[PDB]
Amino acid sequence: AVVTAAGLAWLRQYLNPMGPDTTSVTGYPDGSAVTTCIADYSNTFNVSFPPREALYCTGSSSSEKPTLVDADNYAKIDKWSNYDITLCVLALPMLRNVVMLRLYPHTPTAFALTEQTPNFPQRFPNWSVYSADGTRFNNGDEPGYLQSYVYLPNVDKHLSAARGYRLLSRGITGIFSAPALETQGFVTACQYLAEGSIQSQSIKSDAVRSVTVNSDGTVKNVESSSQTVSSMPRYVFPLDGDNCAPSSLTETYHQAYQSKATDGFYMPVLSSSRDNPFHPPQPRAIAVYGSFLARGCLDPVSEAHEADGPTHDIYRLNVADDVAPLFNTGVVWFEGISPKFSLKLKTRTVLQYIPTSGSVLANFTRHEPTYDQIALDAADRLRNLMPHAYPAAYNDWGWLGDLLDSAISMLPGVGTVYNIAKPLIKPAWNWLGNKVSDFFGNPVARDG
Amino acid sequence: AVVTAAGLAWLRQYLNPMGPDTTSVTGYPDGSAVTTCIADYSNTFNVSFPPREALYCTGSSSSEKPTLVDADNYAKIDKWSNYDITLCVLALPMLRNVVMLRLYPHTPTAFALTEQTPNFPQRFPNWSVYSADGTRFNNGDEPGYLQSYVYLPNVDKHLSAARGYRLLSRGITGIFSAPALETQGFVTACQYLAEGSIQSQSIKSDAVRSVTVNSDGTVKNVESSSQTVSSMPRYVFPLDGDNCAPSSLTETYHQAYQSKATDGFYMPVLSSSRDNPFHPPQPRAIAVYGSFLARGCLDPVSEAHEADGPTHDIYRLNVADDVAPLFNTGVVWFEGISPKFSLKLKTRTVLQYIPTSGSVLANFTRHEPTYDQIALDAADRLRNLMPHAYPAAYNDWGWLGDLLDSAISMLPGVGTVYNIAKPLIKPAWNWLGNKVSDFFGNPVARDG
Amino acid sequence: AVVTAAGLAWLRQYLNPMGPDTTSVTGYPDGSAVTTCIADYSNTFNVSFPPREALYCTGSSSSEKPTLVDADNYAKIDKWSNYDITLCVLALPMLRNVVMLRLYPHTPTAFALTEQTPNFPQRFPNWSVYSADGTRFNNGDEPGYLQSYVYLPNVDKHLSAARGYRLLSRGITGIFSAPALETQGFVTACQYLAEGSIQSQSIKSDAVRSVTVNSDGTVKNVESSSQTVSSMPRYVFPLDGDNCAPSSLTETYHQAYQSKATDGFYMPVLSSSRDNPFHPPQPRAIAVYGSFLARGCLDPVSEAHEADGPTHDIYRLNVADDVAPLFNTGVVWFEGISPKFSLKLKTRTVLQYIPTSGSVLANFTRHEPTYDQIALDAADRLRNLMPHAYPAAYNDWGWLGDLLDSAISMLPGVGTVYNIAKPLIKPAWNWLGNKVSDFFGNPVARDG
Amino acid sequence: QYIPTSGSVLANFTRHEPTYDQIALDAADRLRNLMPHAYPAAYNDWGWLGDLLDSAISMLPGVGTVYNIAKPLIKPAWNWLGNKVSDFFGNPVARDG
Amino acid sequence: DYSNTFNVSFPPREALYCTGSSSSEKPTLVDADNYAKIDKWSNYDITLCVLALPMLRNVVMLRLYPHTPTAFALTEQTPNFPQRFPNWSVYSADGTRFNNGDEP
């Protein structure tokens, strides 16, 4: 009849993962009554303009040879360092490989992606270079942009020894800094769901074609195994590469966060479904869903073209992972950044495990099967109206909890005990103009 | 605590898609808070007995050659026109290709389906002929029935430029007419869920079998790639072809609508689940689930027959599409129709889109993130008791809305404000006998 | 506003499938309004130490030859009969093949499983032998353990003629007996969810490799169809074979039932989700999810190793079946059993069907579309706190129904009419110590 | 009705309701000779049936009578050709089809 | 509970078979285009009897006559391959089994 304390703790960490008050860790209030272990991974990364020693090439040059550094094409990347730059980060719902960093010389027209599978994508301290024409870069080409993945190794080790898992919350903070007199630049942020799913795409097989010139062997075996089969299953993410562009994100979403670069960002990525069931760890190769090339039977075709159906271009990331379903994909863009910047990424990912018997997690479990559907309904009705991102320093939201949770906790059905808490109005998040007001009209003075 | 106006509008269009009052268009009340574009496709088709110019053959004759018209076997189809005929329409949950029309000389024993993939299935104005023995028809065979698909091209164009979609409602009206003194015939209608799903079936590969008679080449490479693999994924629909027959539908379902032919029909197809999540457009080849031929490991078998597991016969429709899950499959049969009939199909399909950034839909969006779980519960408890179909002219249901929605809106949980609206009783839909009574016993006089 | 009688009947049969009062049969209270047939399969099996005539070998010996009995290696199995033994049963959610029996000479270190596909797994009256080293047993090896499946043929026959199905409840009783003065032994029991799912794993193809020594034929066709494709889809069950061991189950779960062997067991397997949608019968080969052997792209690899992604070892059971999703997997262990024991397994499985039109089930249907979300919520909040198993004779739970159902029926939301029923406390299930108390502290005297 | 054979398909659809009623059997025996042999195809759901006819005959068998008088019973006139049809209680039957 | 529905009408030639000695050891024999006589029947009004014996299988027996018969005749000679509903079997005018080239 009334929301529990565990429900409040879960809501607080789910909506404000990196808030200062959220020190303890709590699990999903579904009352599964199973013995679970809740892990909290906090990581920090001081990303900046990479030096030459941490910069590899993904072309066919480093194909069978391992990672190849740049053969002093680094002069061109210094030429990048002469001017302003752009810095995108893409937070896919992948459990490990939490974010993808990407550096551009100028604002890209659209979020391009290589068509050939890159060789040896690099974890964060190293980067990997791509040519300007959306192609893999070998030494001697003309570099277009840089990319890297931010990897959490402990998450991999724990996911190895776990029967099931589910993501509880994830937040990403972007403390930005630059030398004095070089603070110019903008920042944009947006979340959006991606109907990523396990998919296998149609491919064609190789058939031997023998015309036996042998004297005794006149078989002329032309057996045709060249039929249509399924590729290995891959997790495909439909991200709108054209609409992942800066301007498209800005105009598309009314909750898109925009501010000056020095404000940083803070994205508490949110789920998109009421229920959060457990899943077994099934790491699979990730891929990005292009635009379909063979229409196939989508038009009246002969009775033989039914095989090569509506297949799509698949951009293979050459990264294997298991993703948290129903969680939003986040993305921020830093535009016009001074080349000698310094971005302190701070990620906090809290997630639940069912430990495999006799595994390392089995000793750290905790038995608190709290059940609270009031909190679940509160989150369900709160998700659609929370902002997508906030400035870096805007933790410790006063309106959360005492007011917002209480204000929405009285809506659901007949589960209302307190008569009335507070009217709820439309917030106006204008970080550019400094006319920002919260969910109750109270102005937000700038703390930093 | 009380159902909103948006909830009422959504319920009204979901239960009565083609009602006269439902002029405006409203979205699903889940409060996804995303920027969506809601499209409303209304189409009309005056289907009748096709002339010879719009009648192609699906046999191996039109295999590599495109569509082939009938080489004046049309005399037999005129002989059909001498007697009465039967007209089935099958509304699968496919987004485009809204319905499948099918014409028979007499009532079929069962809803047969070709085993070989037909060549060039035809959109509505043209038809495609099939032989009597459930085989593809080449010129010179003996025609068994005709078939066609009703295609919406705008739906295809819009589904191209959309990150996600979900079907809001769909209704099909069947205004029937015939020359005076030839109004004889019956009509039957029924909806039923089909657990259609993405499936890939086991197939076998082709292996080269070389016995090298070459003098220097004595390899005799007999390498066996002839293993078991997966076909390309297809959307398989388990429709009960034996139980899609007329009599089986009549006896099976107590909500099956039956009437005289001149009454037409009006099927507001209904969902079968409470939630309606967004889905990315994934058009795939459609197929119908036959009866499994290789039992495989379903019986104690040798350790080598585990490969060819329980595979089923797959009837390939040679039509690629993406379907709306959790929506019922509808079917109506017109029996004993006069051959010179005239059926005005009127389809209305309203569905939501998430527009891809920079796409054509992005300019037509609308920002009304209404949330109303009362309406969702009302629909959930109303679905099981609505009739499957109504006569063609029975729009503007008085009992809907002011009474039925209100009567059921007070059931759910404690979300009840109004004390009591009206008792709810068992309706008796007897369109044959003219003893029809609605959900409150009020008789329904015949308006047409 | 108040839970119906149908809701009470469904809850009673779902939580106490083999209780004496549950004589009538009732369906899921979701109000699907469809015409359904509810079937109740009760089976009994007097399992004991098998004789030599019912004991086949699964090695390559019985590969193409059918089932091969043991060539009088039965002396070793008699030597087993000299000492104590261990008897595991594993109740997977498979519809047919309800349980897997397994006999060991002593307590196994872990629930091993053969890596090669066994030949002709045997239904219950016969068994199949496996070697000590987790390998298939041919005549002349050294036997390690015995295994068998308990098969329900009527379930197969009915599942053939059904458009859809869903499992309503399933219970397994273990009446144990042994000769006087040989009642020593322990019994342990545990349920746990398994995220079993349809999966296809990466495999590699066979390519012909021809160097044409033919005089006229100098093609040297070395065409490489040796690419990566998908195996046939299989239902993979992630069971923790290391944590399916006795001690791991005992320590892991606080609801694990433990007692003396003579007490038997009674496991009412429970679902793990609120909703229970219908599913079409899709029998597929079952397999057990090992530990992945090829990491693949989980580490930075060359642009060519993306194909052989994170593949797992797959233990193929050589048994095809369709499973009930969201139902727990149960397992009991009998330890130190006297070799001349007698276990009376009593299984009761009640499940719903949608009959295919014109099929055998179509005549036995029943039209009671009751809707009761109160009962669904009651089950949802009751699942996490019910014990995993009870002694064999502990049917007819007094606390169920009049108190427990009523006590929890007042929690959900505002759907509360009766003021207060009874306080609910923590039960203490200690069958070893005879200090057992139910959900209201009332002690449970031993009826047997 | 069937007595299922063990292991057969019928065995999964049994019903335990051994109800006993001499009154119903006696009423059926009494009424067998009164009901007409057939009706028009559309003439189901008779008003007189059950609450009226079965009741008004249920006291006749022996003296198994609790309610004193339910309803007098008269000979019907099933003149379907002449549209002059009257049921067991004289109530005219207007054409419903 | 078995509920069944059938749509009986004047059968086409493909659903008629001969009961005479023609299809004695041979399986059912379709009419050798004596169907013109049945069309002659279709010229005028017909008669349709159904006889519901207490048989569990074979719920009813349908029968079509050119014109009302004086009695429910039957053939002293056993018919060959009696036909389940969608197919019919023809009997001659003289109350005997019908081979092709007789008077139905």
Numbering used by the authors:
A (entry chain D), B (entry chain D), C (entry chain D): 66 to 513
D (entry chain C): 417 to 513
E (entry chain C): 105 to 208
Authors' text:
The RNA genome sizes of LSV1 and LSV2 are ~5.6 kb, encoding three major genes: the Orf1 with the unclear function, RdRP responsible for viral RNA replication, and the capsid protein (CP) for the host recognition and viral capsid assembly. CP forms the capsid shell that protects genomes and is responsible for both host specificity and receptor binding to transport the viral genome into infected host cells, or for intracellular trafficking. We determine cryo-EM structures of T = 4 and T = 3 capsids of virus-like particles (VLPs) of Lake Sinai virus (LSV) 2 and delta-N48 LSV1, belonging to tetraviruses, at resolutions of 2.3–2.6 Å in various pH environments. Analyses of these capsid structures reveal the intermolecular interactions that drive subunits assembly into homo-trimeric capsomeres and eventually into a complete viral capsid in which specific domains, such as the N-terminal domain, the helical domain, and the β-barrel domain/C-arm, could encapsidate nucleic acids.
The models of T = 4 and T = 3 LSV2 VLPs were built and refined with the homo-trimeric subunits A/B/C or D/D/D. Each icosahedral asymmetric unit (iASU) of the T = 4 particle consists of four subunits A, B, C, and D, whereas one iASU of the T = 3 particle comprises A, B, and C subunits with the C/C dimer taking up a position similar to the C/D dimer of T = 4 particles. Accordingly, the T = 4 LSV2 VLP is an icosahedral symmetrical sphere consisting of 240 copies of the 57-kDa full-length CP with 80 apparent trimeric spikes on the VLP surface, whereas the T = 3 LSV2 VLP is composed of 180 copies with 60 trimeric spikes. As a result, the T = 4 and T = 3 particle sizes of LSV2 VLP are variable, with diameters ranging from 494 to 482 Å and 450 to 438 Å, respectively, from alkaline (pH 8.5) to acidic (pH 6.5) conditions. In comparison to the expanded T = 4 and T = 3 particles at the neutral or basic pH condition, measurements of diameters of the shaped holes on the I5 and I2 axes of the unexpanded particles at pH 6.5 show that the minimum and maximum displacements were changed from ~5 to 4 Å and from ~22 to 15.5 Å, respectively. In contrast, the basis of the quaternary change on the T = 4 and T = 3 particles at acidic pH is further flattened on the I2 and I3 axes, respectively, suggesting flattened hexameric capsomeres concomitantly result in a compact particle. Furthermore, the superimposition Cα of CPs between T = 4 and T = 3 LSV2 VLPs at a neutral (or basic) and acidic pH shows no obvious change.
